[PDB]
Amino acid sequence: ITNASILSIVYLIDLSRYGAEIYNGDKVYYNSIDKNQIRLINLESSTIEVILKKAIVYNSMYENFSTSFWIRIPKYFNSISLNNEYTIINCMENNSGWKVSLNYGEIIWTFQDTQEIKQRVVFKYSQMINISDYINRWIFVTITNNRITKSKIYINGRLIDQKPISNLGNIHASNKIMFKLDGCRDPHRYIVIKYFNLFDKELSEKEIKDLYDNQSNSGILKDFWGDYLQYDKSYYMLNLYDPNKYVDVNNVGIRGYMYLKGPRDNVMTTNIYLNSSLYMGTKFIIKKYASGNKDNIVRNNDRVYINVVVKNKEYRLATNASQAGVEKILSALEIPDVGNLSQVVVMKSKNDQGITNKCKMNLQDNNGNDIGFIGFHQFNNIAKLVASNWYNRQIERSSRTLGCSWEFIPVDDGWRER
Ligand code: NI
């Protein structure tokens, strides 16, 4: 696969041996926390142009190739976006070549020969869904092309669609790849992209999985959207075991508790989307404690505190590890009164073998013994938040979703709630 790399863009430069030239328009935006994330908006000046050396300009009936990239597509919210295929990554020249385009709920690959014969492959996702894996969340796209079998589109390493392409003839693509919203009716539309790559082979399923795993940066925790999780940033909490609930606090202090309540409200716009509201419940803020890194990113194994916002004031998530029973009920404590109560949380994305898990917060007692991952337990019809080593034992056996599986959801411009 490294031998197969013919374009590999990072923050912008091409790391490949072909050293593509890259030109950015005046209205490209690079994310401050992760400069590899490039945002393109619906303006003529919001462009990236990549110029490929002659040696790798595609002009063949037979040569195989693949592309991979990550994309984050804001929720479609207005009818102007319905029935509107717009190009985003264009390598067509004189009506032959390849392009990536989007439409309402779609990511589309088009491959076109010099006789105007076209094949497409399409990933479809719904916006009428409780919780989506795709809307406004980072998606890893991979498209592979084998000239004597099929074009194939993979999403997060999984095969979605494939179509025969053996009837396509010579395909003569451009020496320029234009990253630009082209033909988009919605003035507010944008995309975010990262890690654009080309390969001079059809990638195997294993290669695709390994690319997904490696480019995921699994040593850094992620928020719900797939961005790096951060310190000093307000997050709404989603429990993946029961996504219809949200967190609330029934009194501050050590006799109070946090609990899960439901149902969530709907958010909807007729014939455009119907989802659960994400911006509900008690906000959590992760506080830097042990990390010596100067940046603001939360890494696997960082020891942190968790603050909880109650009536616009920060409290400390904590428990008395000496309480009866081994499901330790969590409370929201006044920060000056926490004392030596249990409050240090080990943040987790993956285990020592590299196996990822959505269980994020492993609470420690004051002696550094695990009290357990933070999840919930039902005490007489109330689902109270607890730390429990039951989770820790289960996470050693599988990576399935458990009650300790959480997402941290910050307010993001690609998911607007009324
Ligand atoms: Ni329990």
Side-chain angles (χ1 to χ4, degrees), residues 1-2 4-25 27-166 168-293 295-417:
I1 198 178
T2 43
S5 176
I6 63 172
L7 177 60
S8 185
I9 300 173
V10 300
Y11 185 90
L12 293 179
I13 66 173
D14 174 24
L15 300 177
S16 90
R17 69 179 146 254
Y18 297 102
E21 303 179 14
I22 305 175
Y23 300 88
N24 303 289
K27 292 299 184 337
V28 181
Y29 181 70
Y30 303 102
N31 183 263
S32 305
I33 307 296
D34 180 356
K35 295 262 183 169
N36 278 292
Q37 295 182 356
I38 310 142
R39 191 191 71 203
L40 303 172
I41 63 171
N42 198 1
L43 288 183
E44 286 281 330
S45 52
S46 194
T47 59
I48 306 163
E49 296 168 71
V50 179
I51 312 301
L52 306 172
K53 280 188 165 62
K54 293 156 197 191
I56 57 165
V57 173
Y58 192 92
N59 184 18
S60 188
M61 188 164 167
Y62 302 117
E63 293 174 63
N64 297 342
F65 82 97
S66 306
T67 182
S68 67
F69 56 94
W70 298 74
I71 192 167
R72 197 158 78 89
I73 307 169
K75 191 156 73 183
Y76 294 95
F77 67 89
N78 186 273
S79 66
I80 198 165
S81 283
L82 298 171
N83 183 43
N84 180 215
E85 182 178 347
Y86 58 100
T87 301
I88 56 158
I89 308 173
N90 200 354
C91 200
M92 291 290 179
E93 184 92 32
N94 298 132
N95 235 27
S96 183
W98 59 265
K99 63 180 183 180
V100 180
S101 59
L102 300 182
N103 201 339
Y104 172 79
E106 297 186 347
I107 306 179
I108 305 143
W109 173 252
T110 305
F111 208 29
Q112 182 164 20
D113 77 9
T114 60
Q115 283 200 112
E116 294 182 350
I117 307 178
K118 212 167 257 196
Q119 185 58 279
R120 303 173 178 74
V121 295
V122 182
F123 166 59
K124 300 177 183 194
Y125 60 95
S126 181
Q127 297 203 156
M128 309 308 177
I129 191 168
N130 177 268
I131 302 287
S132 177
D133 286 349
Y134 308 111
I135 302 165
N136 199 46
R137 304 177 76 179
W138 284 105
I139 301 172
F140 180 54
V141 180
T142 315
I143 299 135
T144 69
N145 307 276
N146 179 328
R147 300 307 308 277
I148 53 68
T149 58
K150 300 180 188 215
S151 289
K152 303 180 186 189
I153 183 161
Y154 298 76
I155 295 294
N156 298 334
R158 172 176 76 159
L159 182 64
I160 295 301
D161 187 27
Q162 61 184 13
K163 290 290 182 277
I165 60 168
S166 52
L168 305 182
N170 192 50
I171 296 174
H172 189 167
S174 187
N175 74 326
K176 177 189 277 182
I177 310 172
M178 176 60 87
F179 293 75
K180 178 184 183 194
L181 280 67
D182 197 322
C184 181
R185 210 185 284 123
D186 173 13
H188 305 296
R189 198 97 305 258
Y190 63 92
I191 65 177
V192 201
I193 61 171
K194 178 174 171 175
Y195 294 159
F196 189 83
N197 281 264
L198 298 172
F199 305 88
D200 66 355
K201 70 183 280 187
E202 179 193 30
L203 298 175
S204 72
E205 184 186 328
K206 171 67 167 159
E207 288 169 325
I208 295 169
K209 174 197 157 45
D210 291 349
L211 270 179
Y212 178 51
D213 292 343
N214 292 340
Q215 293 186 356
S216 289
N217 296 326
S218 63
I220 306 177
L221 277 75
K222 306 308 188 302
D223 75 15
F224 178 77
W225 309 116
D227 285 322
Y228 299 147
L229 195 68
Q230 289 183 235
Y231 294 107
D232 295 343
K233 186 163 175 67
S234 291
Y235 293 120
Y236 295 99
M237 302 304 303
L238 179 70
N239 188 287
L240 293 173
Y241 201 77
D242 193 345
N244 298 303
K245 297 215 194 330
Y246 54 91
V247 175
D248 200 5
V249 178
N250 178 259
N251 296 309
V252 301
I254 199 69
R255 291 220 222 120
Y257 56 84
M258 310 188 202
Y259 69 105
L260 287 170
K261 153 185 283 185
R264 291 175 177 271
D265 302 329
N266 287 331
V267 293
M268 61 178 82
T269 291
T270 298
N271 296 156
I272 315 293
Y273 62 85
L274 167 63
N275 316 111
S276 293
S277 174
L278 299 179
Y279 305 148
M280 299 191 73
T282 302
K283 294 176 285 183
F284 282 37
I285 301 165
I286 309 170
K287 305 299 294 182
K288 186 174 279 177
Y289 169 49
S291 177
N293 202 303
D295 71 21
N296 203 230
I297 290 158
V298 182
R299 294 174 170 79
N300 189 43
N301 298 316
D302 278 2
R303 305 119 86 203
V304 310
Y305 302 133
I306 302 294
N307 285 1
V308 177
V309 181
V310 181
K311 309 197 308 200
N312 214 52
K313 171 170 170 199
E314 296 178 45
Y315 294 80
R316 180 62 44 75
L317 179 158
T319 192
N320 186 340
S322 309
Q323 78 189 255
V326 299
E327 270 77 71
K328 308 302 183 177
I329 294 164
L330 306 182
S331 297
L333 277 64
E334 291 269 32
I335 290 156
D337 302 325
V338 186
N340 64 359
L341 291 169
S342 296
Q343 60 182 312
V344 176
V345 173
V346 179
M347 298 300 298
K348 295 296 298 180
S349 58
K350 64 187 183 172
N351 70 18
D352 291 344
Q353 289 68 61
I355 302 155
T356 61
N357 195 287
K358 293 285 189 182
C359 293
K360 292 216 171 24
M361 292 175 283
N362 186 17
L363 185 62
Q364 309 296 112
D365 72 17
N366 193 52
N367 305 113
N369 307 133
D370 289 355
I371 298 173
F373 282 93
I374 293 178
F376 64 84
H377 182 91
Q378 280 256 135
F379 298 89
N380 287 346
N381 280 39
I382 304 172
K384 300 186 176 176
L385 301 194
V386 302
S388 172
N389 282 314
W390 181 95
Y391 296 122
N392 304 58
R393 306 188 287 276
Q394 297 298 314
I395 289 155
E396 293 164 354
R397 289 131 89 168
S398 92
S399 63
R400 73 193 181 271
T401 301
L402 299 174
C404 56
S405 304
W406 298 92
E407 303 275 7
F408 291 84
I409 312 186
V411 175
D412 185 84
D413 289 350
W415 185 286
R416 309 173 184 182
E417 300 193 352

